[PDB]
Amino acid sequence: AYTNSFTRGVYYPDKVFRSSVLHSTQDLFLPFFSNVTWFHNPVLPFNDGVYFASTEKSNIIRGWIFGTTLDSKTQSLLIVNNATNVVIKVCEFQFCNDPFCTFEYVSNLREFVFKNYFKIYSKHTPILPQGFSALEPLVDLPIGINITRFQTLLAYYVGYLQPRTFLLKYNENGTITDAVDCALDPLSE
Amino acid sequence: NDDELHMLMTDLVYEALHFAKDEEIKKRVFQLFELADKAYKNNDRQKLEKVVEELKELLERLLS
Amino acid sequence: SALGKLQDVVNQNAQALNTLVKQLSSNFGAISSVLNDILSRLDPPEAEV
Amino acid sequence: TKCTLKSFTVEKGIYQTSNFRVQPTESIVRFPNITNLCPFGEVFNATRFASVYAWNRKRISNCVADYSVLYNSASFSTFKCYGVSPTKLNDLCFTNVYADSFVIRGDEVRQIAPGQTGKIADYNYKLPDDFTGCVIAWNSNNLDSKVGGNYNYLYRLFRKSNLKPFERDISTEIYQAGSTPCNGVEGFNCYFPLQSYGFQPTNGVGYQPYRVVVLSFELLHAPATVCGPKKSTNLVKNKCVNFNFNGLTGTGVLTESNKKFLPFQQFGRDIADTTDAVRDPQTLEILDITPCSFGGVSVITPGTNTSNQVAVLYQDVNCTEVNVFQTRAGCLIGAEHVNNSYECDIPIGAGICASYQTQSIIA
Ligand SMILES: *[C@@H]1O[C@H](CO)[C@@H](O[C@@H]2O[C@H](CO)[C@@H](O)[C@H](O)[C@H]2NC(C)=O)[C@H](O)[C@H]1NC(C)=O
Ligand SMILES: *[C@@H]1O[C@H](CO)[C@@H](O)[C@H](O)[C@H]1NC(C)=O
Ligand SMILES: *[C@@H]1O[C@H](CO)[C@@H](O)[C@H](O)[C@H]1NC(C)=O
Ligand SMILES: *[C@@H]1O[C@H](CO)[C@@H](O)[C@H](O)[C@H]1NC(C)=O
Ligand SMILES: *[C@@H]1O[C@H](CO)[C@@H](O)[C@H](O)[C@H]1NC(C)=O
Ligand SMILES: *[C@@H]1O[C@H](CO)[C@@H](O)[C@H](O)[C@H]1NC(C)=O
Ligand SMILES: *[C@@H]1O[C@H](CO)[C@@H](O)[C@H](O)[C@H]1NC(C)=O
Ligand SMILES: *[C@@H]1O[C@H](CO)[C@@H](O)[C@H](O)[C@H]1NC(C)=O
Ligand SMILES: *[C@@H]1O[C@H](CO)[C@@H](O)[C@H](O)[C@H]1NC(C)=O
């Protein structure tokens, strides 16, 4: 099962304020109108980076596991949202087949971007729905961790980021309100 | 000193292999290393010195 | 579009200035496009390069 | 004007001779309330260092990094910096600093540098050609050496290939020197890849142990967390000042703005990528940055054949910053502004001309 990503997967590439300007940037973004895998648990490839989104009323999804083996042996990054905060650890955790130290940190359509150090961007909006918004960084995790695969801990969508060129439009208040994927089609070029 | 000599030996082994353009040279250098390694472990000063002098000549031939 | 002949001149000149200014952000092989940063990192003989 | 035109006799007209620049009167420095000191003591005064084959990479962040403590101690035999001068480390602020800790022989210290080769540079600890940071090392003969030999320090002698920059290889797989597989077993042309250092108190200097700490400094388009031992000053607005905001420096006038930065943004840029706004790292207010006024300076003169009296035009700039007449072309000083409109003689700009009349210069 796949859905249309439309124009989602755009985020603020840096922490610089800009306004009333079109800025050309090169970064890992979800390509416009690409396919995202629709899940409704498995270990998935991480590739260059991951676009993750969910549509929930019961708020079942709690977190993610990132790593190479996800089975002790080496370090894995465990990010879990529990009760009032988010707990992040990089221990050599032994995980279950059906789950649900050098660093430790403690902090409806929900969009997230997980990319490599490891940065997390997100956006939470009321209601994969069509429309445009940009995601913003909420945590910077300075972790020397090798991530090739990840697992979602409990519908959600998974896409992959590519070294794609974008032209981003900043409004008067510095919010990205529109964007062009420079390799989508000849008109965008 | 035997430990200083052992360190000299391994420096010569590295360089001798580094400049060992052919395979026969590498083979001889590895054999020399092994002999020195055994001599070191058994505290045989004369065998360790012998290998070091041989490695020095070998490297000089590779460099000059 | 009737007055495009005057607007074209304005656009060409404005574009020339934007092009010139944006060149200041280029490194040209330097460690940094910002002169003030070079001078805040390197000593005289290295900064000169 | 005479020097500009390389002439003793100057003809009637307006000439550009120089440039006016408003100068900074003070320097404002602002940092967040970080009273934490960077744990260099835990690196440099550590009781134990890692083996070179398995070096210890410790990340330094969210602290005050005083490098005069290390640089001027004279306890170090080596203090070599690349991409940065060792005396400016206190002025710079970094996204982070990495302290790579290990023990090698004195003769091997020369290999801890960008562009170098040797068994350490190639098989144990490789620095990139574009390495930025400082390599600090000192004699540890009275710390690590033991009378019977300290063999707790290992280095790699054999490997299948060279290391990539900052690659850490701690594999113990038996090295195959010959043509047949070793299958994890030492023997004919099969060797354990790591050797020990025979560190003894009686060794000559080349064979004495040295403790090496490599401080890799990252200077990226990101906020600093490691910042030098600098004090914060009072914030000054509406004046030409020098400034330093967490390592972000320049010269300009700062004013309170109505720009609304997002919660994660630290500074802003205009349409030509020039900094034009900053979030003060203490009170978190947003200030605009506008450059200190400048402009060409032109001398308006009757020919020196008639008079040596001149008027000076400061282009663009206000008279509040420089017979003072403010006009569209700039601040005109020395010419008398009159009601009577005459035929233009020496043009100034924006409808204004000047002349020498019953005598003095008028505009
Ligand atoms: C992260 O770990 C993976 C292994 O889980 C590394 O991938 C292996 O790399 C070696 C050497 O090129 C290959 O021979 C293996 O076949 C690869 N295995 C897999 C599953 O891809 C990967 O290179 C590591 N990445 C980093 C940056 O360390
Ligand atoms: C998405 O997958 C379907 C097959 O289910 C395919 O027909 C469609 O072209 C794909 N779209 C994109 C953008 O890859
Ligand atoms: C969440 O789990 C962590 C352990 O990983 C625990 O320390 C923390 O108190 C828990 N928080 C809540 C709100 O239950
Ligand atoms: C900027 O924010 C103000 C509220 O302070 C709002 O009225 C205005 O419409 C916003 N501008 C844009 C372009 O969204
Ligand atoms: C290490 O200890 C010495 C003791 O004399 C002290 O002077 C020096 O500042 C200390 N170094 C660090 C980084 O704390
Ligand atoms: C620093 O301390 C002052 C009080 O002296 C306080 O007003 C300010 O908000 C503090 N700033 C930070 C970043 O902690
Ligand atoms: C310039 O000075 C000379 C005297 O050397 C005089 O004869 C001439 O008339 C003067 N010309 C003007 C314009 O004042
Ligand atoms: C000079 O500054 C005053 C305010 O003190 C302002 O009213 C005036 O318009 C300014 N003139 C110019 C040319 O900027
Ligand atoms: C023009 O004349 C009026 C008086 O009628 C005077 O107030 C004004 O200052 C004069 N303008 C100049 C530039 O002298």
Numbering used by the authors:
A (entry chain B): 27 to 66, 81 to 140, 166 to 172, 188 to 196, 200 to 210, 216 to 242, 264 to 298
B (entry chain E): 1 to 64
C (entry chain B): 943 to 991
D (entry chain A): 299 to 620, 641 to 676, 690 to 694
Publication excerpt:
Severe acute respiratory syndrome coronavirus 2 (SARS-CoV-2) is decorated with spikes, and viral entry into cells is initiated when these spikes bind to the host angiotensin-converting enzyme 2 (ACE2) receptor. Cao et al. designed small, stable proteins that bind tightly to the spike and block it from binding to ACE2.
The best designs bind with very high affinity and prevent SARS-CoV-2 infection of mammalian Vero E6 cells. The very close agreement of the cryo-EM structures of LCB1 and LCB3 with the computational design models suggest that the main challenges to overcome are not in the de novo design of proteins with shape and chemical complementarity to the target surface, but in recognizing the best candidates and identifying a small number of affinity-increasing substitutions. The large amount of data collected in protein-interface design experiments such as those described here should inform the improvement of the detailed atomic models at the core of Rosetta design calculations, as well as complementary machine-learning approaches, to enable even faster in silico design of picomolar inhibitors such as LCB1 and LCB3.
